[PDB]
Design a protein around this ligand. Structure first.
Ligand SMILES: [Cl-]
Ligand SMILES: [Cl-]
Ligand SMILES: [Cl-]
Ligand SMILES: [Mg+2]
Ligand SMILES: [Mg+2]
Ligand SMILES: [Mg+2]
Ligand SMILES: [Mg+2]
Ligand SMILES: [Mg+2]
Ligand SMILES: [Mg+2]
Ligand SMILES: [Mg+2]
Ligand SMILES: [Mg+2]
Ligand SMILES: [Mg+2]
Ligand SMILES: [Mg+2]
Ligand SMILES: [Mg+2]
Ligand SMILES: [Mg+2]
Ligand SMILES: [Mg+2]
Ligand SMILES: [Mg+2]
Ligand SMILES: [Mg+2]
Ligand SMILES: [Mg+2]
Ligand SMILES: [Mg+2]
Ligand SMILES: [Mg+2]
Ligand SMILES: [Mg+2]
Ligand SMILES: [Mg+2]
Ligand SMILES: [Mg+2]
Ligand SMILES: [Mg+2]
Ligand SMILES: [Mg+2]
Ligand SMILES: [Mg+2]
Ligand SMILES: [Mg+2]
Ligand SMILES: [Zn+2]
Lengths: 100, 77, 100, 50, 71
RNA sequence: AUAUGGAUUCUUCACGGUAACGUAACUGAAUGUGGAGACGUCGGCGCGAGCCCUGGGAGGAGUUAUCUUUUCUUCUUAACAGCUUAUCACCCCGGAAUUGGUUUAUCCGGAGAUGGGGUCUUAUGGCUGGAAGAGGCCAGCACCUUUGCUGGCUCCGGUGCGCUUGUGACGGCCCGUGAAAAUCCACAGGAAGGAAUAGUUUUCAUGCCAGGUCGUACUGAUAACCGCAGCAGGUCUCCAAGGUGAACAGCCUCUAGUUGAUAGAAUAAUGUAGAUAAGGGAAGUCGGCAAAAUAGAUCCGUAACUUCGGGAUAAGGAUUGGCUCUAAGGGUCGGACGAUCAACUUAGAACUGGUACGGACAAGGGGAAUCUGACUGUCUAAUUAAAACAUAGCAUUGCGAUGGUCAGAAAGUGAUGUUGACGCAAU
RNA sequence: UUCAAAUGAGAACUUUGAAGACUGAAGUGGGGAAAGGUUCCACGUCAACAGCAGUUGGACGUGGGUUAGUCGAUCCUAAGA
């Protein structure tokens, strides 16, 4: 039945003032301010979420290694595999049609 | 804040030139369904991280305590 | 799967003053310990021995230190000994009566 | 409020120091006719207008 | 303030309103020949600035205080 | 700022996996492209966290005429870090009508379903490090004392249309489709820079230095703000225990907080506030003003009229406590049936009483018509809430931009206009 | 609201203890945004103020108190200026 308070000066329930209730090693309940959840990067062509890419706030990508931000393929962290497949098939067939 | 499970890398940390202090913690815990055993923890204070090695066998614990470098500040309990 | 549990009660201090009777105290537990229901179902499941200085209870049934303290407090109140005798625990499942 | 600019806090500091009684030794000076501080302020009677 | 000297190894000073933490640390080192761990500052309600100066472990604040002249 | 280790290079700028993609690293200028920042509301469903409820055990307290293996209370684990953990999505194999799969909610499949085997986001959870050395609960000892010492325990479970909150996949709605920018990252591109007795990567690990300035006390209101005041007024928001019950209703209690508002004595009239009345029942009064009556839930039953949606809780009836029982409605586990565990939901039957039972609290009066406005909505702050205003619908009027309507003292000046007749403007 | 003790020249009103009650988690609880500006805390202390009282106080006198690389401001842009 322990009640909690905000730990900052903002007294309103905005998107940047969300809290979670946790229990401390001291045995009491205390509010825990939580950052807004991240959004997965999306494919450039179809707009679907990219597989194999970490989900973080924009500034946090500068701290992680490059292996978390790309895929070992052309357009790795930009376009998904299916859209890359469509690009290659279209490129080959159109250029062949140009010759004929 | 970091745990190591290999003794070979533990001795390398004790001579990293930035380590000056260490502590030994003895814990009296119960195993799955047997008699109580003494558990010891070796904690190395690095510049950025604290490394903890935990071994549950007292026979190997005694050897590791002796093998610690003589120039390292070791705190017992 | 029902290994016996031993409870030891030391009455050395109260009997020294002579205001306590260890034999009667052990007999009270015989006629008041409930086991799987009502009183008197001690089918070689609860035994309360006596040697003149300590009280030993060994039970293979539902018994606990809290229940033992509960029955001991009832006996002390019956004989008006709450103002002198206190049921104190020294170690796990080992107890004593303090005269103070 | 707890949130205050530097200018406001500096203004409040001066008003605190001006709110004090007149020293007694000044009243014994030759040709002295000053008796009490006529500009005394209480926080609940007159507001600073700030 | 005297409690922080003997116990916390911290010297308390009144400083000019125009001085920042860099200047306070520099001034203490040359005035009293001591090393400074860190400096915390605040502006008092009367319009003056107070600095909490903590010396390094190699120095004792109490020995500095009685050498300055205040005990 | 910089060094070492590691990685890489004589095929100069890494390898594995059919693939989804994996990793401790693993050159990338101009320029270009893309992503994150970055977004409405309502509904049910899944999952998580805290809280609530509860079993065993280890301590302390309370009650003890009698009863109660009883009543109350303590049993906790931060940021961060390592490993692991997922609906959705995607990949490979395979080729489907006797169509199958599948949500509470009907959608999906030869543009490749079901099924078998894999990949990925880490919301979230688990274990470990942080970390028991802390914190919590007790016991045995010293003592004006600067105030202490030594001991133990701090454990293992269950449950859900629960409450609060977060989140995921979906669904409904619009002539309404529900910010911007700073900032960070990836890719495309290939300008340059580069090895053999030698170089390069500070997007891998470790190590070194620094992080200024201003705010920070307290009240936040029946006494710290505004109303001339320590004024029954006014003033934005977060946290939210148990019982009764549909319930953030009323009523009682735990934690915490108050016990403040000039008092004493007496009990006349008249008042203010709260109440009850024999018989009659609106005869009172401009007028049923005021008050009374009705009230929850279950079952039965329900007219004229109607824009077919309503009217409707129409109207009008019956039942309701306590106690002892019965019947039906589920999960999981080794393969045809058993064992075991855990939810309040509904229906029915006996017995029982001063015939009482939504027992306090809570809680619709109804019917037959006329005038008027269609409806919801809106205004005379401090005497008027209405039939007044608005509204959808209907109709008229101007205008094709060198224009209509309107603004400005003027202007190399403005609104409609990020507009173009399914528009703007004026009635 | 009541009893007793303590303090004091003086106590229906201050302090401590005991008892009886209320707010009943959309609180008379625990934090804040505006606004106020030292009202915060201790010691001393009662002429005036707290529409009775007063030994008490948000009163009077004298002092003490607000510590940040991580919470805000600072930076960005919104209608607009
Ligand atoms: Cl302030
Ligand atoms: Cl009267
Ligand atoms: Cl009409
Ligand atoms: Mg903000
Ligand atoms: Mg004052
Ligand atoms: Mg005021
Ligand atoms: Mg500061
Ligand atoms: Mg504060
Ligand atoms: Mg004012
Ligand atoms: Mg005014
Ligand atoms: Mg209910
Ligand atoms: Mg009557
Ligand atoms: Mg009658
Ligand atoms: Mg009449
Ligand atoms: Mg008449
Ligand atoms: Mg009426
Ligand atoms: Mg109307
Ligand atoms: Mg409505
Ligand atoms: Mg009016
Ligand atoms: Mg009116
Ligand atoms: Mg009209
Ligand atoms: Mg314009
Ligand atoms: Mg009430
Ligand atoms: Mg009450
Ligand atoms: Mg005060
Ligand atoms: Mg008075
Ligand atoms: Mg007086
Ligand atoms: Mg004063
Ligand atoms: Zn794509």
């Amino acid at each position: 039945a322990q009640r909690v308070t905000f730990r900052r000066r903002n007294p309103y329930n905005t998107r940047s003032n969300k809290i979670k209730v946790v229990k401390t090693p001291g045995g009491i309940l205390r509010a825990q301010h939580v950052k807004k959840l991240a959004t997965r990067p999306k494919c450039g062509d179809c707009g679907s979420a990219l597989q194999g890419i970490s989900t973080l706030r924009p500034r946090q990508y500068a701290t992680v290694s490059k292996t978390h931000k790309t895929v070992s393929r052309a357009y790795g962290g930009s376009r998904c595999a299916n859209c890359v497949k469509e690009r290659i098939i279209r490129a080959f067939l159109i250029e062949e049609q140009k010759i004929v | 804040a970091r745990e190591i499970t290999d003794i070979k890398q533990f001795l390398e940390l004790t001579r990293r030139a930035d380590v000056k202090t260490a502590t030994v913690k003895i814990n009296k815990k119960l195993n799955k369904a047997g008699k109580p055993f003494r558990q010891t923890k070796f904690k190395v204070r690095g510049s950025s991280s604290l490394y903890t090695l935990v071994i549950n066998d007292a026979g190997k614990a005694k050897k590791l305590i002796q093998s610690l470098p003589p120039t390292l500040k070791v705190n017992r309990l | 799967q029902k290994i016996a549990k031993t409870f030891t009660v030391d009455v050395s201090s109260p009997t020294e003053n002579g205001v306590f009777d260890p034999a009667s105290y052990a007999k009270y537990l015989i006629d008041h310990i409930k086991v799987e229901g009502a009183v008197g179902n001690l089918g070689n499941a609860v035994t309360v021995t006596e040697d003149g200085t300590v009280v030993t209870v060994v039970s293979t049934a539902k018994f606990s230190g809290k229940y033992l303290k509960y029955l001991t407090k009832k006996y002390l109140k019956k004989n008006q000994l709450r103002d002198w005798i206190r049921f104190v625990s020294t170690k796990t499942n080992e107890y004593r009566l303090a005269f103070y | 409020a707890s949130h205050k600019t530097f200018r406001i806090k500096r203004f409040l500091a001066k008003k605190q120091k001006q709110n004090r009684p007149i020293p007694q030794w000044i009243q014994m000076k030759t040709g002295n006719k000053i008796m009490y501080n006529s500009k005394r302020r209480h926080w609940r009677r007159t507001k600073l207008g700030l | 303030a005297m409690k922080k000297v003997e116990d916390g190894n911290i010297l308390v000073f009144q400083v000019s309103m125009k001085a920042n933490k860099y200047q306070i640390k520099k001034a203490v080192k040359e005035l009293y020949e001591v090393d400074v761990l860190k400096v915390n500052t605040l502006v008092r309600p009367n319009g003056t600035k107070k600095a909490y100066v903590r010396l390094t472990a190699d120095y004792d604040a109490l020995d500095i205080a009685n050498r300055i002249g205040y005990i």
